[PDB]
Amino acid sequence: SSLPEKDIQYQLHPYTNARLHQELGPLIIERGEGIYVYDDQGKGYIEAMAGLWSAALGFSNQRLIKAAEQQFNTLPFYHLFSHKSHRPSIELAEKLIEMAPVPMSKVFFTNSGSEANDTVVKMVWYLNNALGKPAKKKFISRVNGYHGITVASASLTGLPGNQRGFDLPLPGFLHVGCPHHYRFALAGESEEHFADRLAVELEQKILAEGPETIAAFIGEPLMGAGGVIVPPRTYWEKIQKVCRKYDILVIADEVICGFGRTGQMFGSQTFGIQPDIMVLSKQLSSSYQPIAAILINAPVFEGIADQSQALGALGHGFTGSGHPVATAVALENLKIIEEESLVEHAAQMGQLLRSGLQHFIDHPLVGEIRGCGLIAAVELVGDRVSKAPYQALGTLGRYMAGRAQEHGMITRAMGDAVAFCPPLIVNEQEVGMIVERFARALDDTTQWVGP
Amino acid sequence: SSLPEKDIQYQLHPYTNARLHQELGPLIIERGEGIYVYDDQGKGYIEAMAGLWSAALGFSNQRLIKAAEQQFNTLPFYHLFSHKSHRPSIELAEKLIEMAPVPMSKVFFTNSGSEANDTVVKMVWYLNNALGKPAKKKFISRVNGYHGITVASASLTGLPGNQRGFDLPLPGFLHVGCPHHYRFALAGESEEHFADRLAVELEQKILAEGPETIAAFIGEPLMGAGGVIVPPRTYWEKIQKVCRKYDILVIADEVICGFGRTGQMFGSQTFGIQPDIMVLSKQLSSSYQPIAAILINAPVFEGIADQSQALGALGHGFTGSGHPVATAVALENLKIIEEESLVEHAAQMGQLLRSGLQHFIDHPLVGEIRGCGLIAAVELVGDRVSKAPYQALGTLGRYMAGRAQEHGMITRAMGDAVAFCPPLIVNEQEVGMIVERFARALDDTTQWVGPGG
Ligand SMILES: *Cc1c(COP(=O)(O)O)cnc(C)c1O
Ligand SMILES: *Cc1c(COP(=O)(O)O)cnc(C)c1O
């Protein structure tokens, strides 16, 4: 009958406890503008996550809306199968290739990040069969990495919450350590030496598995959903040397880091990664349309092209691959990010965010503050010396996130860390408000944990 | 540089020979209106495939475009994670549940058909773990079925072109026969007996694999990409009895059949299927937005809900799941289909299409004319008695499709069959034009072959 009642009756929600949902119902979000969303009671919230790490231009960018309209009225749907094409897919693909931080050869479009990583898995398998290396198939990823939730991409993902009860990972999807100094460094170990030990771990993993069986290493430049985990200094340098030593492809999952999130246009620039393949989504279209993109370099394309010829055609593609409305919106989105100098602006807003949060560095429940550019997290602990949680891992984060919402801010808990990933258009005072609302939530949480 | 040159330079095309693409370049489609698209030279074509079996309302429905606008200007993106919701997802889900041809409990949204089928795989695995049946995991599908192209959903798919080179199918993804009488029936075998033999095949497959290890059977009510293959009479009845005997879930992949394609609202109605899970996409939004929907019945939901509680939350969801613009467009799309009586209209347009094509039933190159509702195919052969192809399999289909395009019509060849899946809004005279353009293409193809006889 009521709208909340209909939701409970008819929707199975993602990333939601279904039974609790039947009791509590939804928080229905009705409208958005700038960095704000409003619920159906008219309460406004700063969307400090940009939705799902994604709405770079906020929730009422008229240029994107008009670009959708203009394309809708020209050609509202067509496809790229069997030599068919259309201008928006062509022009977007050109723009993505030309702005890539390393030389890239081709773009392949999907709807989601998960589909894109799933497609990259198939591409690498197809590639290595093309080349006559049928054993070179295994993927290496990392504990706490997030790469999506198809059967294959959830296998790449290294978060237990995405695997438990789903019979994952599949075989051939291997995991090395999470590069988080605060949690996994040895006592008195430096960042650089933590990085050394991670590179050794990767090489030993490869040697134990048989280097000839390892096709690819995939990683987010910095880990998003897994906690805003910034890798230790020299990690990417040392990891890439191990990969290049055994002819292992380096895949940068830029689904969150892409398009100005980390202080430069790509996480690959910020962290000195020269990937063979890049995966892009989210900020690509400010999530105004579902779209993702895979960039592959020359060797990857040439092997695939050779096979697609021998086997008649590339037996892969989604109905929505390169959708003309989604590609048109993404094209306009990238033009706005360039014309408005949002990469530079976000970097400056990020410095303000990070300096604001650092006033709480000696709070008794603050275990670590981390991030770079305009992405950050504050990890809470029940005890700073031991780094132990209050009650059980997740208890603090759950409480903090709930308090932040009460104070008009949407953040996301990742265990006991709360994340910040605001729209790139956030202004200085809005950053101040984000920090103030974080502060109030923290104060509430501290009184709740109590003496 | 020119637009075709940019395409060749920068895009890897799906379902395209990449090397041939570098030589020929693209056919760039510039605009659409009604049932027509126009290329960049201004030549018009009837889109007899509705794009990819999908654009129910044609290529310039203003109501859908305005519904997108109105939602863009309210809330252009949000998500459904962690109890968050929004009106368009809620109202769409209600509408889908209430119109379902069997009692259904919940809707889960994805972007694509492939994602939806991939998600259904995970849901079934999660479900059976929830129920304490950890061995009950394998899926059974069919030769020539199409269910998408993720690693898992390409394993469900039974077309060799989707598996060759990709190390698929994964283990646990099993295949029984294509239910196409014309190609796989024994000499002088009836439809009903062909159906018996297929049901026996399925039961033997289950028994050989261990019934306790089989979770689900999935099928398109009629097979789309694999050839517009109408199953033989009594197939679905007998297949479901085998499934119910061993407590195997029945999943109807309605990605093509959904929303009026086959003569009734759902392929499940047309063919008497009582599925536990339905998968919907394509006509859902006339492909104006990427969206797919999974309908799950009460037992499937209850088990999933039970576990999500014990494990804290359901560890699954796409950023675009239930996207407010895509759901708003699909909602308006389903309203138009109902208000304009397009299911009934498509049924009538389909009988005209079929009657038109049947004037060529005794043509020496026409092996079979099949379909129902407003989906059809004409399978061409080089020799009717042997059913053998002219030159290689595919030669006639490729030539026919090329001639159809020259005559202003886009059809898709599936080997030597050419498909018809026009927008539901096609009128009687447009059906006449589709059949005329098919006839000219067939006339060209006949002159090219020279059947003599
Ligand atoms: C969100 C995300 C994905 C998956 O994207 P979907 O569109 O939600 O499937 C993949 N990789 C990373 C790093 C992500 O953050
Ligand atoms: C087209 C199709 C799919 C896959 O849809 P995408 O949106 O292209 O992933 C799945 N099943 C059937 C029956 C289809 O026709």
Short mmCIF file of N, CA, C and O in Angstrom, two decimals, chain B residues 241-312:
data_model
loop_
_atom_site.label_atom_id
_atom_site.label_comp_id
_atom_site.label_asym_id
_atom_site.label_seq_id
_atom_site.Cartn_x
_atom_site.Cartn_y
_atom_site.Cartn_z
N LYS B 241 7.94 -32.13 -15.65
CA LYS B 241 7.68 -33.31 -14.81
C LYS B 241 8.98 -33.99 -14.37
O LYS B 241 9.08 -34.44 -13.23
N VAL B 242 9.95 -34.09 -15.28
CA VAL B 242 11.27 -34.63 -14.91
C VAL B 242 11.91 -33.71 -13.86
O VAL B 242 12.39 -34.19 -12.84
N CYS B 243 11.88 -32.40 -14.09
CA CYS B 243 12.45 -31.47 -13.11
C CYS B 243 11.75 -31.58 -11.74
O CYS B 243 12.40 -31.61 -10.69
N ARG B 244 10.42 -31.63 -11.73
CA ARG B 244 9.71 -31.63 -10.46
C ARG B 244 9.97 -32.95 -9.72
O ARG B 244 10.08 -32.96 -8.50
N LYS B 245 10.15 -34.03 -10.46
CA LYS B 245 10.47 -35.33 -9.89
C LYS B 245 11.75 -35.32 -9.04
O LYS B 245 11.85 -36.07 -8.06
N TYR B 246 12.72 -34.50 -9.42
CA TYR B 246 14.00 -34.50 -8.74
C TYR B 246 14.24 -33.20 -8.02
O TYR B 246 15.37 -32.90 -7.66
N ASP B 247 13.18 -32.43 -7.80
CA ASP B 247 13.27 -31.17 -7.08
C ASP B 247 14.33 -30.26 -7.72
O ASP B 247 15.20 -29.73 -7.05
N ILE B 248 14.22 -30.09 -9.04
CA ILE B 248 15.11 -29.21 -9.79
C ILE B 248 14.35 -27.93 -10.14
O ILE B 248 13.23 -28.00 -10.64
N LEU B 249 14.97 -26.79 -9.88
CA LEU B 249 14.33 -25.50 -10.20
C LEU B 249 14.22 -25.33 -11.69
O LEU B 249 15.10 -25.76 -12.42
N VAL B 250 13.13 -24.71 -12.12
CA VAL B 250 12.88 -24.40 -13.52
C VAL B 250 13.02 -22.89 -13.69
O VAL B 250 12.29 -22.10 -13.08
N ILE B 251 14.00 -22.51 -14.50
CA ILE B 251 14.30 -21.12 -14.77
C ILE B 251 13.92 -20.80 -16.20
O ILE B 251 14.48 -21.37 -17.14
N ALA B 252 12.97 -19.89 -16.38
CA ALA B 252 12.60 -19.44 -17.72
C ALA B 252 13.39 -18.19 -18.09
O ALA B 252 13.26 -17.15 -17.44
N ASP B 253 14.26 -18.32 -19.08
CA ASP B 253 14.97 -17.16 -19.62
C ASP B 253 14.08 -16.48 -20.66
O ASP B 253 14.00 -16.91 -21.82
N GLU B 254 13.40 -15.43 -20.22
CA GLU B 254 12.43 -14.68 -21.01
C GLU B 254 13.05 -13.39 -21.57
O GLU B 254 12.35 -12.46 -21.93
N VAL B 255 14.37 -13.34 -21.67
CA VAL B 255 15.01 -12.13 -22.13
C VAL B 255 14.51 -11.69 -23.52
O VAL B 255 14.28 -10.50 -23.71
N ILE B 256 14.31 -12.62 -24.45
CA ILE B 256 13.68 -12.31 -25.73
C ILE B 256 12.16 -12.45 -25.71
O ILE B 256 11.45 -11.56 -26.23
N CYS B 257 11.66 -13.55 -25.13
CA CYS B 257 10.21 -13.83 -25.14
C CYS B 257 9.36 -12.86 -24.32
O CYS B 257 8.18 -12.69 -24.60
N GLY B 258 9.95 -12.20 -23.33
CA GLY B 258 9.18 -11.36 -22.44
C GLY B 258 8.54 -10.14 -23.07
O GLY B 258 9.13 -9.49 -23.94
N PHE B 259 7.32 -9.85 -22.63
CA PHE B 259 6.58 -8.64 -22.99
C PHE B 259 6.01 -8.64 -24.41
O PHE B 259 6.13 -7.66 -25.16
N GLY B 260 5.35 -9.74 -24.74
CA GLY B 260 4.46 -9.78 -25.90
C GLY B 260 5.05 -10.36 -27.18
O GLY B 260 4.43 -10.26 -28.23
N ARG B 261 6.25 -10.91 -27.12
CA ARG B 261 6.94 -11.34 -28.32
C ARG B 261 6.29 -12.57 -28.94
O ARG B 261 6.30 -12.71 -30.16
N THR B 262 5.75 -13.47 -28.12
CA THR B 262 5.34 -14.80 -28.60
C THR B 262 3.84 -14.98 -28.71
O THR B 262 3.39 -16.09 -28.95
N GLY B 263 3.06 -13.93 -28.52
CA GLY B 263 1.61 -14.04 -28.68
C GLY B 263 0.85 -13.87 -27.40
O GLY B 263 -0.34 -13.62 -27.43
N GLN B 264 1.55 -14.00 -26.28
CA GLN B 264 1.02 -13.70 -24.96
C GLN B 264 2.10 -12.89 -24.24
O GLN B 264 3.17 -12.64 -24.79
N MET B 265 1.82 -12.40 -23.05
CA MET B 265 2.75 -11.46 -22.41
C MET B 265 4.10 -12.15 -22.18
O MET B 265 5.13 -11.54 -22.32
N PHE B 266 4.08 -13.43 -21.84
CA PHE B 266 5.31 -14.15 -21.55
C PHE B 266 5.37 -15.47 -22.30
O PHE B 266 4.36 -16.13 -22.47
N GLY B 267 6.57 -15.85 -22.73
CA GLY B 267 6.79 -17.16 -23.29
C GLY B 267 6.34 -18.29 -22.37
O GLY B 267 5.95 -19.35 -22.85
N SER B 268 6.41 -18.07 -21.06
CA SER B 268 5.91 -19.06 -20.08
C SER B 268 4.42 -19.35 -20.21
O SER B 268 3.97 -20.47 -19.98
N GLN B 269 3.64 -18.34 -20.59
CA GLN B 269 2.21 -18.53 -20.87
C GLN B 269 2.01 -19.29 -22.16
O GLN B 269 1.34 -20.31 -22.19
N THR B 270 2.62 -18.81 -23.23
CA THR B 270 2.48 -19.44 -24.52
C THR B 270 2.82 -20.95 -24.45
O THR B 270 2.16 -21.75 -25.09
N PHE B 271 3.83 -21.32 -23.66
CA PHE B 271 4.31 -22.71 -23.67
C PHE B 271 3.98 -23.50 -22.41
O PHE B 271 4.43 -24.62 -22.25
N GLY B 272 3.17 -22.93 -21.52
CA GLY B 272 2.76 -23.64 -20.29
C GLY B 272 3.90 -23.95 -19.36
O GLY B 272 4.05 -25.09 -18.90
N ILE B 273 4.74 -22.96 -19.08
CA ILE B 273 5.85 -23.13 -18.15
C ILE B 273 5.47 -22.49 -16.81
O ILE B 273 4.94 -21.38 -16.77
N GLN B 274 5.74 -23.20 -15.72
CA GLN B 274 5.55 -22.68 -14.37
C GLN B 274 6.92 -22.54 -13.73
O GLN B 274 7.30 -23.33 -12.89
N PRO B 275 7.67 -21.52 -14.14
CA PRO B 275 9.05 -21.41 -13.66
C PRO B 275 9.15 -20.93 -12.20
O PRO B 275 8.26 -20.24 -11.73
N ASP B 276 10.22 -21.32 -11.52
CA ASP B 276 10.53 -20.81 -10.18
C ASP B 276 11.18 -19.43 -10.22
O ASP B 276 11.04 -18.66 -9.27
N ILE B 277 11.89 -19.17 -11.31
CA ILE B 277 12.69 -17.97 -11.51
C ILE B 277 12.53 -17.54 -12.97
O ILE B 277 12.54 -18.38 -13.88
N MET B 278 12.31 -16.24 -13.19
CA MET B 278 12.21 -15.72 -14.54
C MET B 278 13.26 -14.63 -14.74
O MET B 278 13.52 -13.86 -13.83
N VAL B 279 13.83 -14.58 -15.93
CA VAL B 279 14.82 -13.56 -16.25
C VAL B 279 14.30 -12.71 -17.40
O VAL B 279 13.85 -13.23 -18.41
N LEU B 280 14.37 -11.39 -17.23
CA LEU B 280 13.74 -10.44 -18.13
C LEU B 280 14.72 -9.34 -18.47
O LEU B 280 15.52 -8.94 -17.64
N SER B 281 14.69 -8.90 -19.72
CA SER B 281 15.50 -7.77 -20.15
C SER B 281 14.94 -7.27 -21.52
O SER B 281 13.75 -7.46 -21.78
N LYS B 282 15.76 -6.59 -22.33
CA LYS B 282 15.47 -6.29 -23.77
C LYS B 282 14.19 -5.51 -23.88
O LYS B 282 14.19 -4.30 -23.59
N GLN B 283 13.07 -6.17 -24.19
CA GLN B 283 11.82 -5.44 -24.36
C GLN B 283 11.36 -4.75 -23.07
O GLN B 283 10.47 -3.89 -23.11
N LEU B 284 11.93 -5.14 -21.94
CA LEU B 284 11.64 -4.53 -20.64
C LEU B 284 11.68 -3.01 -20.71
O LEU B 284 10.79 -2.33 -20.18
N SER B 285 12.68 -2.48 -21.40
CA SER B 285 12.83 -1.03 -21.56
C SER B 285 12.88 -0.60 -23.04
O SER B 285 13.29 0.50 -23.33
N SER B 286 12.42 -1.46 -23.95
CA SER B 286 12.67 -1.33 -25.40
C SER B 286 14.15 -1.09 -25.72
O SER B 286 14.50 -0.46 -26.72
N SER B 287 15.01 -1.63 -24.85
CA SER B 287 16.45 -1.33 -24.81
C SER B 287 16.81 0.15 -24.81
O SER B 287 17.95 0.49 -25.14
N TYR B 288 15.88 1.03 -24.42
CA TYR B 288 16.22 2.45 -24.30
C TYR B 288 17.18 2.68 -23.11
O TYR B 288 17.91 3.66 -23.07
N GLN B 289 17.16 1.77 -22.16
CA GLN B 289 18.10 1.80 -21.04
C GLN B 289 18.57 0.37 -20.74
O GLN B 289 17.79 -0.57 -20.89
N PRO B 290 19.82 0.22 -20.31
CA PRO B 290 20.25 -1.13 -19.95
C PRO B 290 19.63 -1.54 -18.62
O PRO B 290 19.91 -0.94 -17.59
N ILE B 291 18.77 -2.54 -18.65
CA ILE B 291 18.18 -3.04 -17.44
C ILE B 291 17.71 -4.46 -17.62
O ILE B 291 17.22 -4.82 -18.69
N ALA B 292 17.91 -5.26 -16.57
CA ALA B 292 17.34 -6.61 -16.54
C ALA B 292 16.76 -6.87 -15.15
O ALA B 292 17.10 -6.18 -14.20
N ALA B 293 15.85 -7.83 -15.07
CA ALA B 293 15.15 -8.14 -13.85
C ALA B 293 15.04 -9.62 -13.67
O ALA B 293 14.84 -10.36 -14.63
N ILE B 294 15.25 -10.06 -12.43
CA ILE B 294 15.08 -11.45 -12.02
C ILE B 294 13.85 -11.50 -11.11
O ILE B 294 13.79 -10.76 -10.12
N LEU B 295 12.88 -12.34 -11.45
CA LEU B 295 11.76 -12.62 -10.57
C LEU B 295 12.01 -13.97 -9.92
O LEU B 295 12.25 -14.95 -10.62
N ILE B 296 11.97 -14.01 -8.58
CA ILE B 296 12.13 -15.26 -7.81
C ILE B 296 10.89 -15.53 -6.98
O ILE B 296 10.28 -14.60 -6.42
N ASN B 297 10.51 -16.80 -6.91
CA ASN B 297 9.30 -17.18 -6.20
C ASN B 297 9.55 -17.30 -4.70
O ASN B 297 10.68 -17.05 -4.23
N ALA B 298 8.53 -17.67 -3.93
CA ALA B 298 8.60 -17.56 -2.46
C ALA B 298 9.69 -18.45 -1.83
O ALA B 298 10.49 -17.98 -1.03
N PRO B 299 9.75 -19.74 -2.20
CA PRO B 299 10.79 -20.60 -1.64
C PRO B 299 12.20 -20.09 -1.93
O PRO B 299 13.04 -20.11 -1.05
N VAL B 300 12.45 -19.64 -3.16
CA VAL B 300 13.75 -19.11 -3.51
C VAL B 300 14.10 -17.90 -2.63
O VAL B 300 15.21 -17.84 -2.07
N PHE B 301 13.17 -16.96 -2.48
CA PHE B 301 13.42 -15.80 -1.62
C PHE B 301 13.63 -16.14 -0.16
O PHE B 301 14.53 -15.62 0.50
N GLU B 302 12.79 -17.01 0.38
CA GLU B 302 12.86 -17.28 1.82
C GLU B 302 14.20 -17.85 2.24
O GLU B 302 14.73 -17.48 3.29
N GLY B 303 14.74 -18.78 1.45
CA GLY B 303 16.03 -19.40 1.76
C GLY B 303 17.17 -18.39 1.70
O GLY B 303 18.03 -18.35 2.58
N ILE B 304 17.16 -17.58 0.64
CA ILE B 304 18.13 -16.50 0.46
C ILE B 304 18.06 -15.51 1.63
O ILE B 304 19.10 -15.14 2.20
N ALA B 305 16.85 -15.08 1.97
CA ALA B 305 16.68 -14.15 3.10
C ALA B 305 17.21 -14.71 4.41
O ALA B 305 17.86 -14.01 5.20
N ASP B 306 16.94 -15.99 4.65
CA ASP B 306 17.41 -16.69 5.86
C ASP B 306 18.93 -16.58 5.96
O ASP B 306 19.45 -16.15 6.99
N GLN B 307 19.64 -16.93 4.89
CA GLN B 307 21.10 -16.88 4.94
C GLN B 307 21.64 -15.46 5.07
O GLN B 307 22.61 -15.25 5.82
N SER B 308 21.04 -14.50 4.36
CA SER B 308 21.54 -13.10 4.36
C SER B 308 21.54 -12.53 5.78
O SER B 308 22.37 -11.66 6.11
N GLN B 309 20.59 -13.01 6.58
CA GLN B 309 20.48 -12.68 7.98
C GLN B 309 21.65 -13.30 8.75
O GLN B 309 22.42 -12.59 9.40
N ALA B 310 21.80 -14.62 8.64
CA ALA B 310 22.88 -15.33 9.33
C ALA B 310 24.29 -14.81 8.95
O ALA B 310 25.16 -14.73 9.80
N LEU B 311 24.48 -14.44 7.68
CA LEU B 311 25.77 -13.90 7.20
C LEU B 311 25.86 -12.37 7.21
O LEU B 311 26.75 -11.82 6.57
N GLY B 312 24.92 -11.68 7.85
CA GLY B 312 25.02 -10.24 8.00
C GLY B 312 24.35 -9.41 6.92
O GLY B 312 23.64 -8.46 7.24
#
